[PDB]
Design a protein around this nucleic acid. Structure first.
Ligand SMILES: [K+]
Ligand SMILES: [K+]
Ligand SMILES: [K+]
Ligand SMILES: [K+]
Ligand SMILES: [K+]
Ligand SMILES: [K+]
Ligand SMILES: [K+]
Ligand SMILES: [K+]
Ligand SMILES: [K+]
Ligand SMILES: [K+]
Ligand SMILES: [Mg+2]
Ligand SMILES: [Mg+2]
Ligand SMILES: [Mg+2]
Ligand SMILES: [Mg+2]
Ligand SMILES: [Mg+2]
Ligand SMILES: [Mg+2]
Ligand SMILES: [Mg+2]
Ligand SMILES: [Mg+2]
Ligand SMILES: [Mg+2]
Ligand SMILES: [Mg+2]
Ligand SMILES: [Mg+2]
Ligand SMILES: [Mg+2]
Ligand SMILES: [Mg+2]
Ligand SMILES: [Mg+2]
Ligand SMILES: [Mg+2]
Ligand SMILES: [Mg+2]
Ligand SMILES: [Mg+2]
Ligand SMILES: [Mg+2]
Ligand SMILES: [Mg+2]
Ligand SMILES: [Mg+2]
Ligand SMILES: [Mg+2]
Ligand SMILES: [Mg+2]
Ligand SMILES: [Mg+2]
Ligand SMILES: [Mg+2]
Ligand SMILES: [Mg+2]
Ligand SMILES: [Mg+2]
Ligand SMILES: [Mg+2]
Ligand SMILES: [Mg+2]
Ligand SMILES: [Mg+2]
Ligand SMILES: [Zn+2]
Lengths: 111, 101, 118, 147, 49, 53
RNA sequence: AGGUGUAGUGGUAGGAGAGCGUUCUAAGGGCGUUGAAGGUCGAUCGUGAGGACGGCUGGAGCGCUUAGAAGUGAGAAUGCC
RNA sequence: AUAUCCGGGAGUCAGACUGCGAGUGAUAAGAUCCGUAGUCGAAAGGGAAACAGCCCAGACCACCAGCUAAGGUCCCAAAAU
RNA sequence: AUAGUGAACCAGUACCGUGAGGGAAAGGUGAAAAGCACCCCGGAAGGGGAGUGAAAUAGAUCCUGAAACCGUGUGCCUACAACAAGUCAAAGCUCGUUAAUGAGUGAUGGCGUGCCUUUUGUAGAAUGAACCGGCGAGUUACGAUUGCAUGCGAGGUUAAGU
């Protein structure tokens, strides 16, 4: 009744690098958060921005919250499942590759 | 006013209205207990026993018998594939001091 | 019949981990590290129940020594004098009088000094 | 009963004492001073709490060095660079840095931990008879019978 | 007798000793065999006589 | 040369103290009001120094 | 059935004794959609292995007593997955 | 207050240092090899700064009680400046 | 379902090998699909509502959902300190229990060189373990012999077989 959330699951991005961007917006107003993400060149910014914009859309369309007062009350990146690959290395052996994914959640509250 | 009494192989300072915990006394809960080995009576003045104050007594009532929290003795020697474990709960008697004579 | 591992293994390890709560990092997290440290804690706890008795008698004697000197007497002479006067007050009680009831400690010191002279 | 007294930080009042080092052997001065700094002279002594007093040492230049200590007692220190061993004699310290002579002697006699280092700060040494700490109203500590 | 109250005669039945099940049993680790040598080996030991 | 010991959680966290992003130099566009990087053309309205460019 | 008294009670290899817990069988006696097992949490009990009791989770089974049989207890094998 | 004897079950067959008595050695070795006693091994505690084998002493447990052993008592650091 | 056949499942398959030959992994929504119409953000993926359902934190990677590991919030502590990291003593602060001479944290002080194996002797600058979970080692048959137990006793007892 006071908050809305959005999550992007199994996003093909590194959780560690996504958290670098997520840390920039935690506790910030949605308007400030959008500006930060827009001018962050790192890849996860575009993904996080869509999750945030999805959460803001949820707050207005589903719960009729005042968009202009929304703040980022919670934001975190959880590890998704890892796709297992292999890179052939020198002298006939292979080395594993972790192609990691992320669960990204953004919670936004009326104030 | 206070006194020092000899109980349970130890010595405990005592004041009327205060509850002490001592080694298990063989007296039922709620019964009267009297300590006749008083070694010092204090307060306004001071009385010193040699070793016991002459004819001084401390009276109290056993509120409760209980057991202290369990202490574990675990004995082991490194590399000697040998350990021993033992539990213990020491019984106590809680005595309310009612009169220092 | 076949007896699979079941839940006994997990139950046992969880007891050890509970004993390791508050230990640093892996020592409260990993069973093997936690068990090794719980064993060392047991060794220390048993040894230290003996040592705590030494430490407190050491504390009382030092406090009695300070109070004795404030009454013109060394610790060792005071305990000799109290022994001569047939005073059985122990070091825990004397240290308590030294701090909380100095007048009573002085009265004891005077009896000891009297006994030393005799 | 677990009723043994324990001192707390801030409850115990710390007094200020002046000790005269004149013609007192360095070590015997330091030993009695070290005990005061630790609180060993007071019945409230509590090993994990600072309960000792403040000590002003005056006339450190006239501290006594028995035997040949003035020329044969050597204070080594290493810079931790190779061949970085530096030395000075006790006699040379007494003439030029008598605070260091007294402070070094007392430092060795205090515990080598946080509390002991804290207790060392309560020591103030002056070469000569006068100190700037009259505002603390220090009282004379007569150590003739204590050494 | 009753099937829910069976009782063997005293001393008629004993509990088997299982070796290599912890040190406090007294037969943990080396299982009573001691340390190394031919008699510590599986199937170890010399023929009778 | 290989790690002699695995790095603990605390030590790894301490090393990553300085592994972070920064968002420096954002201020409002003088033409449209949306936030922009200073000394850069506003990506929203395309203006700079009060002029459409 | 217990009580008193005296003495004794470090321990590797190893001997002896007595138990804890696991799965299954039999009989008896029970508990379960008014929530079984399992999971998780708790400041609980016993001399030890270990045992309860609550909250939460969970959604079907499972204790207890006596006796029986065991693929019956793991932290180490550069162990296997 | 143990001794034998009969039988079931073992483990052990690398020992170490210290004192004392000898050999080997250079009356060298933390050397080697016997004899003899002890400790370690398989023994925690106190002392010897740290220090299996030295000195004191053998931990069933609880105590914020007392007396001692070796060793100690100016400060670190308990106790005689 | 790491068991039980190698194979509960499209397994002698995939995969490896020139070939003979070697040889896996992989079961579970729900009573019923009633498997989320429609709306909203998004290119989609994926979410948020709205619904279905007893329950969807049962949404198909679907029962339960441990641990390692990764993260978010924060009650207490931490930037003069050399620390197998605990233990004993302990202020302060924050909490209130299977109500118990309670719980969490912990300045500061004393003491303190992991576990295992193997050794005369190992904190060992000997060995082994990255971590967590599961699996993983004195068994059975026939005989010998001793203890205990029961039956009978100068007797005891059947085997094959029906
Ligand atoms: K054997
Ligand atoms: K502009
Ligand atoms: K429960
Ligand atoms: K392993
Ligand atoms: K010898
Ligand atoms: K012996
Ligand atoms: K469910
Ligand atoms: K935390
Ligand atoms: K500590
Ligand atoms: K090696
Ligand atoms: Mg190639
Ligand atoms: Mg297992
Ligand atoms: Mg059997
Ligand atoms: Mg044994
Ligand atoms: Mg083992
Ligand atoms: Mg072996
Ligand atoms: Mg051997
Ligand atoms: Mg052998
Ligand atoms: Mg004993
Ligand atoms: Mg079951
Ligand atoms: Mg098994
Ligand atoms: Mg493992
Ligand atoms: Mg030799
Ligand atoms: Mg051996
Ligand atoms: Mg020893
Ligand atoms: Mg050893
Ligand atoms: Mg002293
Ligand atoms: Mg003298
Ligand atoms: Mg299979
Ligand atoms: Mg399964
Ligand atoms: Mg298979
Ligand atoms: Mg659930
Ligand atoms: Mg599930
Ligand atoms: Mg400093
Ligand atoms: Mg600081
Ligand atoms: Mg060797
Ligand atoms: Mg090692
Ligand atoms: Mg090393
Ligand atoms: Mg290794
Ligand atoms: Zn603009």
């Amino acid at each position: 009744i006071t908050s809305a959330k959005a999550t992007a699951k199994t996003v093909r991005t590194s959780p560690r690098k996504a958290r670098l961007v997520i840390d920039l917006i935690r506790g910030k107003s949605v308007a400030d958060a959008i500006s930060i993400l827009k001018f962050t060149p790192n890849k996860s910014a575009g993904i996080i921005e869509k999750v945030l914009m999805s959460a803001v859309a949820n707050a207005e369309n589903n719960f009729d919250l005042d968009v202009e007062s929304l703040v980022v009350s919670e934001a975190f990146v959880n590890e998704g499942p890892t796709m297992k690959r292999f890179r052939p290395r020198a002298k006939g052996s292979a080395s594993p590759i972790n192609k990691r994914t992320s669960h990204i959640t953004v919670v936004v509250t009326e104030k | 006013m206070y006194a020092i009494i000899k109980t349970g192989g130890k010595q405990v300072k005592v004041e009327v209205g205060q509850a002490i915990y001592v080694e298990k006394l063989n007296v039922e809960a709620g019964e009267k207990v009297v300590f006749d080995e008083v070694i010092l009576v204090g307060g306004e003045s001071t009385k010193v026993g040699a070793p016991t104050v002459a004819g001084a007594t401390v009276e109290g009532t056993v509120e409760k018998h209980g057991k202290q929290k369990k202490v574990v003795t675990f004995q082991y020697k490194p590399k000697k594939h040998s350990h021993r474990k033992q539990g213990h709960r020491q019984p106590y008697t809680k005595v309310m001091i009612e009169a220092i004579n | 019949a076949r007896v699979k591992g079941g839940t006994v293994t997990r139950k046992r390890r969880k007891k050890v981990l509970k004993l390791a709560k508050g230990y640093y990092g892996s020592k409260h997290t990993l069973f093997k590290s936690a068990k090794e440290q719980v064993m060392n804690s047991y060794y220390y706890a048993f040894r230290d129940r003996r040592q705590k008795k030494r430490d407190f008698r050491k504390l009382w004697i030092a406090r009695i020594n300070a109070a004795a000197r404030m009454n013109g007497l060394s610790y060792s002479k005071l305990m000799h004098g109290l022994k001569l006067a047939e005073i059985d007050i122990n070091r825990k009680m004397l240290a308590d009088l030294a701090v909380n009831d100095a007048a009573a400690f002085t009265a004891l010191a005077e009896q000891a000094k009297d006994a030393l002279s005799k | 009963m677990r009723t043994t007294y324990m001192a707390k930080a801030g409850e115990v009042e710390r007094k200020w004492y002046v000790v005269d080092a004149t013609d007192v052997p360095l070590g015997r001065l330091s030993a009695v001073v070290a005990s005061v700094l630790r609180g060993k002279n007071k019945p409230t002594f509590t090993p994990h709490v600072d309960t000792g007093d403040f000590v002003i040492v005056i006339n450190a230049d006239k501290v006594k060095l028995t035997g040949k200590k003035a020329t044969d007692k050597i204070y080594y220190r290493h810079s931790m660079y190779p061949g970085g061993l530096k030395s000075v004699t006790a006699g040379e310290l007494r003439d030029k840095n008598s605070r260091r002579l007294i402070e070094t002697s007392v430092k060795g006699m205090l515990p080598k931990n946080t509390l002991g280092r804290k207790q060392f700060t309560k020591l103030n040494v002056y070469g000569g008879a006068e100190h700037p700490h009259a505002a603390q109203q220090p009282e004379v500590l007569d150590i003739t019978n204590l050494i | 007798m009753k099937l829910h109250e069976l009782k063997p005669a005293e001393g008629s039945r004993q509990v088997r000793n299982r070796v290599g099940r912890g040190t406090s049993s007294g037969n943990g680790k080396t299982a009573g065999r001691g340390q190394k040598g031919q008699k510590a080996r599986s199937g170890g030991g010399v023929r009778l006589g | 040369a290989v790690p002699a010991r695995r790095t603990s959680k605390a030590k790894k966290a301490k090393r990553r103290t300085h592994y972070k992003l920064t968002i420096k130099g954002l201020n409002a566009c003088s033409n449209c009001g949306e936030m922009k990087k200073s000394h850069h053309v506003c990506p929203a309205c395309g203006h700079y120094d009060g002029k459409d460019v």
